[PDB]
Amino acid sequence: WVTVYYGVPVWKEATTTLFCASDARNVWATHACVPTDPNPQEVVLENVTENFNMWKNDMVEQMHEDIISLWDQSLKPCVKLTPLCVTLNCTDYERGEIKNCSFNITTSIRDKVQKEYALFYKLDIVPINNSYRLINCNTSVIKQACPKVSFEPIPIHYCAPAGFAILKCNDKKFNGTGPCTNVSTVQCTHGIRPVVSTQLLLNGSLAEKEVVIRSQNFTNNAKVIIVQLNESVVINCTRPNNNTRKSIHIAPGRWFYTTGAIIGDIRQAHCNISRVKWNNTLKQIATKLREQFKNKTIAFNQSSGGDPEIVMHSFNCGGEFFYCNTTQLFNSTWNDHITLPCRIKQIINMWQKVGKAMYAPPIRGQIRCSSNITGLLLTRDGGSNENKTSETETFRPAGGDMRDNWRSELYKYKVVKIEPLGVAPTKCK
């Protein structure tokens, strides 16, 4: 006899939009999210296993779309730089990293146009004599971030809609692929802070016992391997100078901000990372990479490539954009602080979106940043047909795809739907 049951504890993999929740407008305007439950504890599913794949996981794709959308929602109404895209006459003030440039400005919300000056970085300048244009004062649109809007990562929790559940893999050293034998479930994920960086991942979760490395295909050199440390390596970064800001009227209701003055002398931005922790970190990574590649000597050979956003380590700090010289870190080899000059840019090709860019306002000097350094994004350098000559594997820093930064955390989660109805035979009326 067919007996009907309701409340059957079964589920299937399913895709659905996840609900945003918070711990409690900037970019991460989480006041629009629903605060999570107190004591949001999980349920351990004993004798339940599940099959995970971090490179298929759609939670990463949803997260990707939210971070882009939020960034555009907050930048949309802000002052345009575009009306200022004129050719300017500039002087040289390590040389002339920050330059005092000037033009007969045609905005200034007036008919009586005037000469005005501003301080810009050479990093954002295309020479055009001593005249120039900015790098995105070509075939792209530049908007400046509102001075009232911070980025503020904030940990964000994603929750299943009712009728759905998130299964979490708690199996130690799990690589994000295949069956997980330690599975528990939650309505909501833990809060994950957005991280905006390349090459090195910032504060986030750590590996349980030892550094672990994950890849969709380790032998495919077109893929990036994600290295998760079991300990962090703290780094401090600064901009050891003072500055002032100046406004330009662009529109009757909008002001554009540039550096007004350099206060005190000019000094290079830089980072200072513990050398001992860094050296131990690469030895640990190389050890695990050797297990993955059996037994080859492993070397770190600095970055390479074109665009500095990929080649230099990048990160956000407050509202500032830093690019750092990691050639001082990705060095040496194993077969068993450190100062990084940095650069500050004002025009950001965020998301590598073609045709658009953001301009960052001045912070008036005194930049103080810090981070944990929790993992690496690496690619292999090469190989080709060879006449049985030699060996040694080498790696380089990688980045530019924000989905890997998210993937490095989302690898522990899967979304399923709950299907409470079913039948089974018994006996009945």
Partner: antibody, heavy 125, light 100 residues
Framework: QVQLVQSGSGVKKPGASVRVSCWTS?????????IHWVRQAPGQGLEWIGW?????????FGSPDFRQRVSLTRDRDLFTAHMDIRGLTQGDTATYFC????????????????WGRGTLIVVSS | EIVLTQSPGTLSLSPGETASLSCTAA????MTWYQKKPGQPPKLLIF???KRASGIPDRFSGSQFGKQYTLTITRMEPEDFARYYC?????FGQGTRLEI
């Protein structure tokens, strides 16, 4: 068989540099994950040179000699890519080709779905 | 280490009969096949997953079940008497040629 457009053929003297371009249609370019470059010297099999990633400009090389002498770049506004070879020797005479890969997942391997016609680069006295 | 090798290299054929080519490689994995005529870039025949590439009128196919992959060439048609190559990611075979 969609063709890609390459810069032309020519002869260079030793030590010279050559600009090998590869242009494609806007949709062909956008649907490509990787741009691959290969070399086929007369009498030789096909040698992989390297690749440049279509979004980031990130690179990977076959031989370390290419890693030192060959710059692989991309331009998303122009829908082009380039292979800039410096330090040419007579041993580099070959037909050079650009090709593109539309494949994106693990387990698929590498592909040449789209091809240019190749350019003949000759290096001599 | 020679990661990928290809053979027979030189094949003596009789059109109407079916030919076979093979490649073996270190670390296994999927591998593709391409063929070219002089003056042209090679065309993809076999996807790394052994699937037939578009444009081929059901002439080429094969399988692995080891470090080796073997494909056959239907009826040795002279139209396909091209130089063939295997590819395993960054490695290529030295190639083979079909000759009557």
């Amino acid at each position: 068989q969609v063709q890609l457009v390459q810069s032309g053929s020519g002869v260079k003297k030793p030590g010279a540099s050559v600009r090998v371009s590869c242009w494609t249609s806007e949709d062909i370019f956008e649907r490509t994950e990787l741009i691959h470059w290969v070399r086929q010297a007369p009498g030789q099999g096909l040698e992989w040179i390297g690749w440049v990633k279509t979004v980031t400009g990130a690179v990977n090389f076959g031989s370390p000699d290419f890693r030192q002498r060959v710059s692989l770049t991309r331009d998303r506004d122009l829908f082009t890519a380039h292979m800039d070879i410096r330090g040419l020797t007579q041993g580099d005479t070959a037909t050079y080709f650009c090709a593109r890969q539309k494949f994106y997942t693990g387990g698929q391997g590498w592909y040449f779905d789209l091809w240019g016609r190749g350019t003949l680069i000759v290096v001599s006295s | 280490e020679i990661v990928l090798t290809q053979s027979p290299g030189t094949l003596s054929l009789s059109p109407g009969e079916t030919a076979s080519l093979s490649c073996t490689a270190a670390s296994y994995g999927h591998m593709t096949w391409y063929q070219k005529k002089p003056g042209q870039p090679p065309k993809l025949l076999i996807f790394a997953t052994s699937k037939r590439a578009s444009g081929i009128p059901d002439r080429f196919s094969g399988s692995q079940f080891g470090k080796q992959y073997t494909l056959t060439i239907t009826r040795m048609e002279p139209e396909d008497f091209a130089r063939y190559y295997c590819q395993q990611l960054e490695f290529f075979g030295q190639g083979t040629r079909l000759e009557i």
